Amino acid sequence: RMKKKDEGSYDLGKKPIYKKAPTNEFYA
Amino acid sequence: RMKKKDEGSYDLGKKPIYKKAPTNEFYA
């Protein structure tokens, strides 16, 4: 798709993820 | 887009999110 005009369609982003978590012990 | 043939393009999913966390106290 370099200097050739003509595109595709739609857009969106990619994949809806869902992760997240800390990482530490509650002890000195 | 009902019984009219012709579609769009691309596909992907939507938006890549990233959330996740528990919810409880470490005490009885």
- Our measurement of the CA-to-CA distance between the termini of chain A, rounded to an integer number of angstroms, reads 56 Å
Note the overall shape of chain A: rod-shaped
As a whole number of angstroms, the C-alpha radius of gyration of chain A is 21 Å
Query: Using DSSP, what is the number of strands of chain A?
Result: 0
What does this structure look like?
Chains A, B: This is Syndecan-4. Chains A, B: Residues 1-28 are cytoplasmic. Chains A, B: Belongs to the syndecan proteoglycan family. The structure is a homodimer of 28-residue chains. The first copy, chain A, is mostly loops and 28 residues long. Helix content of chain A is 0%, strand content 0%. Chain A contains no helices and no strands. Chain A binds chain B through residues 8-22, 26, and chain B through 8-22, 26.
How would you summarize the topology of this molecule?
The structure is a homodimer of 28-residue chains.
Chain A lengths: L28
PDB class: signaling protein
Keywords: symmetric-parallel-interwinded dimer, signaling protein
Assembly: dimeric
